[PDB]
């Protein structure tokens, strides 16, 4: 009926290597993806680090520029790729997606994962 975001509880990636934080859903007829955001939990408050909208991709903090991508081309796959993982990258990440509904308004879903960085 309404789309369901799929994000695992935790992801573990190699220090100074790369990792994929999955965020996927089964696309439904009549649901149009209008926004994707990835946020990171710095403090008690999430801050946006990636935004995809009608004008494309926007990387919102300077330390991610050239490190952060959402590159899968499969519809419904908005997984986050972070290259050269740092200790500082250990945090909780939110994947948030906004769709237009068949009825003309919008619905939004989000899900939190914990990123662990392994030596």
């Amino acid at each position, epitope marked *: 009926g309404r789309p369901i975001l799929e*994000v695992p509880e935790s992801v573990t990636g190699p220090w100074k290597g790369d990792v994929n934080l999955p965020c996927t859903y089964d696309p439904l007829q009549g649901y149009t993806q209008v926004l994707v955001k990835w946020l990171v939990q710095r403090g008690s408050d999430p801050v946006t680090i990636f935004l995809r909208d009608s004008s494309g991709d926007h990387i919102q903090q300077a330390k991610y520029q050239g490190r952060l991508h959402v590159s899968h081309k499969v519809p419904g796959d908005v997984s986050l790729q972070l290259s050269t993982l740092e200790m500082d990258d250990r945090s909780h990440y939110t994947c948030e997606v906004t769709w237009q509904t068949p009825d003309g308004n919008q619905v939004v879903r989000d899900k939190i994962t914990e990123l662990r960085v392994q030596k």
Partner: nanobody
Framework: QVQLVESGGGLVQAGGSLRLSCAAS????????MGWFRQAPGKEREFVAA????????YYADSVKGRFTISRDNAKNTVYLQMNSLKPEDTAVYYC??????????????????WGQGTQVTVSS
């Protein structure tokens, strides 16, 4: 992976107050939006209240808005449901629930992965 246990249910009189608690196992409690649902005799389970992982943003069913307040203490792995101005139609089994939603969908059972067994609240006339 998360086990939930509700406590503090019981028999209370109409007009009274009752405070429920739900304790979570694990060391990821900060990662979870927490919710209360309830189910009365013969009726389907319905949303009551939810609270974001950081505390602060809270969400309520119109039926209990204002009368009930949800809170959490992340240091203690506990969510609370302060039920004020109780009415007999509040009688139900109350379930604690946990999901990894951040800001959205908190009113929907399907957004929650883990459930307690529930605790009985009875408000007498």
């Amino acid at each position: 992976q998360v086990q939930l246990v509700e406590s503090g249910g019981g028999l209370v009189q109409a007009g009274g107050s009752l405070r429920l608690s739900c304790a979570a196992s694990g060391r990821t409690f900060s990662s979870y939006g927490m919710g209360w649902f309830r189910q009365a005799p013969g009726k389907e389970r319905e949303f009551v209240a939810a609270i974001r992982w950081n505390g602060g943003s809270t969400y309520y069913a119109d039926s209990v808005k204002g009368r009930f307040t949800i809170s959490r203490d992340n240091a203690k792995n506990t969510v609370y449901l302060q039920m004020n101005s109780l009415k007999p139609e509040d009688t139900a089994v109350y379930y604690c629930a946990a999901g990894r939603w951040d800001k959205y969908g908190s009113s929907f059972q399907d957004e929650y992965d883990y459930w307690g067994q529930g605790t009985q609240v009875t408000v007498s006339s």
